[PDB]
Amino acid sequence: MELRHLRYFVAVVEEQSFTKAADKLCIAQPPLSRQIQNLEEELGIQLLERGSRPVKTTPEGHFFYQYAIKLLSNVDQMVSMTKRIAS
Amino acid sequence: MELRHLRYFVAVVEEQSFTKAADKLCIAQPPLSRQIQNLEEELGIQLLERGSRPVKTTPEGHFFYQYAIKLLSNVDQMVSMTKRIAS
Ligand code: NA
């Protein structure tokens, strides 16, 4: 699992759309969908209700989502601070 | 930046060796070294003292290291708990 998977997943959850998330991340929809599938397959879980319109998380999916946003925020803080040290 | 970069970096810092870190991560040394260089180049900073034997972090490198281990621990906790929900 990579940060890309988390960033893609968060965008899908927030936009409630695979296409709209793809637009926001400046990528095509098909690879985005494949990456989220890859994430679910790696974890051995369903993060999203399959076939849900608009896109809705499963309970474990929403749990994962809430911790994913926390982690991505921490990444941003880490990178920002480390850069500020060197400059 | 991806989780791979953090995992590679942490291993190098802890083993104080590019080769020994590669052994631990079950990969060849050359791609490992390239990935760490890629990480430093992306951030625009030196995480390791260039030419140091044994491998030693820069002050910003050690700072980054300490937050990287925290983040990787959080990733592990997130994945473990989310899996435990679905099972
Ligand atoms: Na990653």
UniProtKB/Swiss-Prot annotation, chains A, B:
DNA-binding span(s): 18-37
Source organism superkingdom: Bacteria
Protein name (Swiss-Prot/TrEMBL): HTH-type transcriptional regulator BenM
Domain comment in the entry: Contains a secondary binding site for benzoate in addition to a primary effector binding site that can accommodate either cis,cis-muconate or benzoate. The existence of this secondary binding site may explain the synergistic effects of cis,cis-muconate and benzoate.
Binding partners and assembly: Homotetramer; dimer of dimers. The dimers can also associate to form linear, higher oligomers (in vitro).
Residues of the full protein shown: 1 to 87 of 304
Ranges in coiled-coil conformation: none
Family, as annotated: Belongs to the LysR transcriptional regulatory family.
Domain HTH lysR-type: 1-58
Organism, scientific name: Acinetobacter baylyi (strain ATCC 33305 / BD413 / ADP1)
Function: Positive regulator of the ben and cat genes for benzoate degradation. BenM is necessary for ben gene expression but not for expression of the cat genes, which can be regulated by CatM. Binds to the inducers cis,cis-muconate and benzoate.
